[PDB]
């Protein structure tokens, strides 16, 4: 048979395609089909259940909210206007899944089992440092165009959902992308700890759009550069050149992006609007303080001077560097910033005068909403604390996303280690056992 | 003589070896497994713990269980035909007769099984270290499901057979016996945790220290079911660990005996600790700590902290966990921190 | 000199070193010496730490009233949260020891080094011509330290919520965890105990089967161990006799005869199970907790019929309601 047990074992079947470019193409074309299929098929599933007059986060949605962010079918405050863009994006993908799926199935069971001969342009050689650097170069451009495909939707075709909208959350057209490298790349030099949050600290659409402009170019630039080159010297005396080794490198890459994504959806307020997803972890703990400082203040309590059990400040206290923040266990989230809460902040943090008479109703109910929709829930979807009662069936989209992606991100890091460990033994050549005859260890002096 | 003929038949090499032992093992082992599976889906724990405990009532694989008998029963064996049930079956069920049934039966079933190992070992002519090892699990079952409640007021405080019904057994022990602070429980875990390490570590050391005896990548087929050479470089393994950890085996006979020892010793220790919890002779407190905490209100250790967690567990659980005590704890008497 | 640096690289990487200081080692050896040295001093002499940011210092060192079992190195303040607190961030050490500075210096260096320790478990295997993957087995216990020392804190918003470095301090981490996440009722933890229980189980199985089927080469009054010489050609036990016995205990096809498949299983089981347990803590770090079956089964009128799931909730409430006495000022525990 073209490929059977005298290749690899059954459960390692797909490794039998390591050297059949053609068929190995069907896989990638058939697979890429499953992703479009899902994206498409799921969107329609979401929409089929979607209830306009009800929070998205209260409906187990995770795609419609992705579209909403790009400014589609929504308006003032994340209000859903037209469900058409959703239905569209959904069906379109679903269709393209059939097109791709066709090609996949075709290239894997009819077309050429190898490519090198049925066209030397597409056929390839793993150790062919140039073909590799080049195909990589092609893809580095396709991805680059994509990065601009966003910059376009935002600057020309409609905008994106800006929750920080001056008049209050709303679809806004970005016509002033931050292009200043000093700022853009500044983010990469930002600490990943409390406060300075690195990439996840992005907090306005200009930088988002601006930064994507830079990536699109920088990306396509490298796409051409690889098309027009070969790895230098070190680049060659450093890496392993093989089918597995290349995989591994891309495995460790996704893993890392998987962890970064987990933190983005968990912490970021901007590119993940609390209006479509739920309120952030810190955002919800903040809202409780808001809610009760607001309540009790109406009962005649002077929030500014209230002393709590420990003598720290029931409602307001100070952070380690002097700024006025909310008190209680919520002292850990004093780095939370959000449309609803900002108008209360002064140059020194929460201003006792604004808190004292500028709190607006929409804020009181925002704080209440977010307080009662914190990202706490159970596997069987029972919103709240582990000791809560059944009734409110809910688990924040931010919790779902974050966990799923930490698991995937993780296992992929194992995947990395595994495929990289195999590649290094494969190269030097011992990934199948120690040479009974020449057993390396046996030629080394005894350390004893 | 019929005896040797009876023997002959039994010790006959079938698909599922019977043996003399089987005459005890299979009857029991099946009844135990059966009774559980029965109660799990049909019998309730209402008349016993005021709890729904079977599929028939709405419980799922996690919440279902064969709950212990009432506390009124005491240590009664609760025989189907005894003073309690009085031959009646349904009543037996409602009085938790199914617990002592599963308990006592399974108990003999563990005796039979170890005997089996012993019997089969003898026939096949191998050493009985598989039987010695299994003493560990017996001890656990014996001390926990029998000795323990035998020291308490009744079977009611023995672990009920079920998934969740076992988690409360855990939480209870923390809350009431402060079991995690017990030297013996610690040894216990050091062994189980440490045993699950030898397991993993030895396995990997072997799979990645193998000689090449085939031309394939899937090296599984490359194995000689018929001895001969060592299938992995014991010599290479030694050097590896000797350079990464500093210490490394070098006597497969010892490396393997060690693997029997570690987890069997661990479980034995965890048993003794419980045999002591039967009399409530727990490892609850450190007197020097309590004395300083009394006189000085600013002294705080992660220990004192824990004890408070226990107080809460006891106060908030005791009511629905010990129904026979008709506990009534007014809201004002319930220990609680601020706000929560 | 063939070239200093050329030489250096030959030593570092030398496979003739008593202890293989590798490339990963160059990062490991220092970070691990700092973590260890700071810990030992802390655990012995560090002063009380305001772990909960409420000015209520918890002393956890020997010289300040603790014993081995109670003593621990306390987590950085909650006032600090996830902020980086290197010594050079404090007006003084006195201030640094009070806000639990030592904790970070330790967890960060340890986690750093323990990773390189993995990177090393690969390198040496390479320099020795043996298959990799051992380091992948060690990815499980490491992925746990990570989950318990970093993921959980990142997820929860503070390092003060990371597992303390001490015996009792750990039980605290557990008891509270259970209350806030009901972990015992989570699939991942269960898979965890299956792997650990199972491991110990199998560890005993293998251990005994093998040890019990050893070929006789020793006296009646001579350690049965001597019957093995380091650097043997053939095997030291009858894996065919082993399988013969075990196949009869249960039944033939339910028994291993392939030492390689046996040992893969032996490694696969615990590592896979612990991987899930680590993913459990890393998952409940974002509040996706265990199953909540509170008041599920209710009767014909609407009355609530308790299950063991409920008796578990009471025990959890006790923990909830009593942990961190003075740290809460509001109704819901969202932190």
């Amino acid at each position: 048979r073209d490929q059977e047990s005298s290749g690899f074992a059954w459960w390692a079947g797909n490794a039998r395609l390591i050297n059949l470019s053609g068929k190995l193409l069907g896989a990638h074309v058939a697979h890429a089909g499953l992703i479009v299929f899902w994206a498409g098929a799921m969107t329609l599933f979401e929409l089929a259940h979607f209830i306009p007059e009800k929070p998205m986060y209260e409906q187990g949605l995770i795609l419609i909210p992705h579209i909403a962010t790009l400014g589609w079918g929504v308006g003032p405050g994340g209000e859903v206007v037209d469900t058409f863009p959703f239905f569209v994006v959904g069906v379109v993908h679903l269709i393209s899944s059939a097109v791709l799926g066709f090609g996949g199935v075709y290239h894997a069971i009819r077309g050429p089992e190898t490519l090198e001969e049925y066209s030397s342009f597409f056929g390839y050689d793993w150790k062919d440092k140039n073909k590799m650097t080049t195909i990589l170069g092609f893809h580095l451009i396709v991805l680059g165009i994509g990065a601009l495909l966003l910059v376009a939707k935002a600057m020309f075709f409609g905008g994106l959902y800006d929750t920080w909208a001056p008049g209050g959350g709303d679809v806004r057209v970005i016509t002033n992308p931050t292009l200043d490298p000093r700022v853009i790349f500044g983010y990469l030099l930002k600490s990943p700890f409390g406060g300075e949050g690195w990439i996840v600290s992005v907090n306005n659409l200009e930088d988002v759009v601006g930064g994507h402009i830079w990536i699109g170019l920088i990306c396509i630039a490298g796409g051409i550069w690889h098309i027009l080159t070969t790895p230098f010297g070190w680049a060659r005396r450093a890496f392993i050149w093989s089918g597995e080794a290349y995989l591994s490198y891309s495995l460790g890459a996704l893993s890392m992006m998987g962890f970064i994504a987990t933190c983005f959806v968990w912490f970021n307020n901007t590119v993940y609007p609390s209006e479509f997803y739920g309120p952030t972890g810190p955002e919800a703990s903040q809202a409780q303080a808001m809610t009760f400082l607001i309540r009790d203040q109406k009962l005649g309590a002077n929030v500014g001077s209230a002393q709590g059990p420990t003598g720290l400040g029931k409602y307001l206290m100070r952070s380690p560097t002097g700024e006025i923040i909310f008190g209680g266990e919520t002292m850990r989230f004093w780095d939370f910033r959000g449309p609803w809460l900002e108008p209360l902040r002064g140059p020194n943090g929460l201003d006792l005068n604004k808190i004292k008479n500028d709190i607006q109703p929409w804020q009181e109910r925002r704080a209440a909403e977010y307080m009662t929709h914190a990202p706490l829930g159970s596997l069987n979807s029972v919103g709240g604390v582990a000791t809560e009662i059944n009734s409110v069936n809910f688990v924040s989209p931010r919790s779902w996303l974050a966990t799923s992606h930490f698991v995937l991100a993780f296992f992929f890091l194992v995947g990395h280690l595994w495929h990289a460990g195999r590649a290094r033994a494969a190269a030097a050549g011992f990934e199948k056992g120690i040479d009974r005859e020449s057993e390396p260890v046996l030629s080394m002096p005894s350390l004893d | 003589g019929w005896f040797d003929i009876l023997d002959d038949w039994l010790k006959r090499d079938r698909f599922v070896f019977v043996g003399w032992s089987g005459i005890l093992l299979f009857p029991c082992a099946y009844l135990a497994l059966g009774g559980w599976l029965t109660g799990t889906t049909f019998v309730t724990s209402w008349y016993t713990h005021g709890l729904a405990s079977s599929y028939l009532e709405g419980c799922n694989f996690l919440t279902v269980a064969v709950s212990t008998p009432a506390n009124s029963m005491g240590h009664s064996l609760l025989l189907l035909w005894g003073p309690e049930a009085q031959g009646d079956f349904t009543r037996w069920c409602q009085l938790g007769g199914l617990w002592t049934f599963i308990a006592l039966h399974g108990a003999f079933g563990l005796i039979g099984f170890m005997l089996r190992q012993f019997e089969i070992a003898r026939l096949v002519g191998v050493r009985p270290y598989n039987a010695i090892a299994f003493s560990a699990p017996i001890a656990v079952f014996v001390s926990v499901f029998l000795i323990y409640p035998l020291g308490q007021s009744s079977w009611f405080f023995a672990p009920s057979f079920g998934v969740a019904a076992i988690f409360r057994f855990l939480l209870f022990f923390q809350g009431f016996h402060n079991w995690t602070l017990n030297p013996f429980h610690m040894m216990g875990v050091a062994g189980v945790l440490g045993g699950a390490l030898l397991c993993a570590i030895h396995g990997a050391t072997v799979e990645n220290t193998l000689f090449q005896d085939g031309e394939g990548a899937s090296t599984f087929r490359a194995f000689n079911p018929t001895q001969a050479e060592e299938t992995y470089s014991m010599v290479t393994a030694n050097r590896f660990w000797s350079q990464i950890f500093g210490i490394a085996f070098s006597n497969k006979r010892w490396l393997h005996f060690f693997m029997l020892f570690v987890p069997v010793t661990g479980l034995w220790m965890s048993a003794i600790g419980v045999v002591g919890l039967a009399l409530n002779l727990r490892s609850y407190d450190f007197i020097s700590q309590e004395i300083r905490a009394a006189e000085d209100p600013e002294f705080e250790t992660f220990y004192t902290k824990n004890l408070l967690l226990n107080e809460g567990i006891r106060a908030w659980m005791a009511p629905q966990d010990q129904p026979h005590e008709n506990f009534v704890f007014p809201e004002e008497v319930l220990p609680r921190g601020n706000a929560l | 000199s063939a070239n200093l640096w050329e030489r250096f690289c030959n030593w570092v990487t030398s496979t003739d070193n008593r202890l293989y200081v590798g490339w990963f080692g160059v990062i490991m050896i220092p970070t691990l010496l700092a973590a260890t040295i700071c810990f030992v001093i802390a655990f012995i002499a560090a002063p009380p730490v305001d772990i909960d940011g409420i000015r209520e210092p918890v002393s956890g060192s020997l010289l300040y009233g603790n014993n081995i079992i109670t003593g621990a190195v306390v987590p950085s303040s909650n006032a600090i949260g996830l902020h980086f607190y290197p010594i050079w961030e404090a007006a003084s050490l006195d201030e640094w020891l009070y806000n639990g500075g030592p904790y970070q210096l330790i967890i960060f260096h340890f986690l750093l080094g323990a990773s390189c320790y993995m990177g090393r478990q690969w390198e040496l295997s390479y320099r020795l011509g043996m298959r990799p993957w051992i380091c992948v087995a060690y990815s499980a216990p490491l992925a746990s330290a990570f989950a318990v020392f970093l993921i959980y804190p990142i997820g929860q918003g503070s390092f003060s919520d990371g597992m303390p470095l001490g015996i009792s301090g750990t039980f605290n981490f557990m008891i509270v965890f259970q209350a806030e996440h009901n972990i015992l009722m989570h699939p991942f933890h269960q898979l965890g105990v299956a792997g650990v229980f199972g491991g110990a189980l199998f560890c005993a199985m293998h251990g005994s089967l093998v040890t019990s089927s050893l070929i006789r080469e020793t006296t009646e009054t001579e350690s049965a161990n001597y019957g093995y010489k380091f650097g043997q050609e053939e095997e030291t036990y009858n894996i065919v006799a082993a399988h013969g016995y075990f196949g009869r205990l249960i039944f033939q096809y339910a028994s291993f005869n392939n030492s390689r498949s046996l040992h893969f299983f032996l490694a696969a089981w615990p590592v896979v199970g612990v991987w899930f347990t680590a993913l459990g803590i890393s998952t409940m770090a974002f509040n996706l907790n265990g199953f909540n079956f509170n008041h599920s089964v209710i009767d014909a009128k609407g009355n609530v019929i308790n299950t063991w799931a409920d008796i578990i909730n009471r025990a959890n409430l006790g923990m909830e309601v009593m942990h961190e006495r003075n740290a809460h000022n509001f109704p819901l525990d969202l932190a």
């Binding site: 005894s446 004893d448 | 010599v235 030694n238 000797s242 500093g246 210490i247 490394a248 070098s250 | 008593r18 202890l19 030992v40 012995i44 020997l62 010289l63 014993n67 081995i68 010489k229 380091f230 650097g231 043997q232």
Partner: peptide
């Protein structure tokens, strides 16, 4: 008095460690 006892045993285990790693019986082949 207690502190001293705890540290002593610890110090003794580390000493053991040393001797075990650097003063084991060299592991001889065949």
């Amino acid at each position: 008095m207690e502190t001293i006892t705890y540290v002593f045993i610890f110090a003794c285990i580390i000493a053991l460690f040393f001797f075990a790693i650097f003063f084991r019986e060299p592991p001889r082949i065949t």
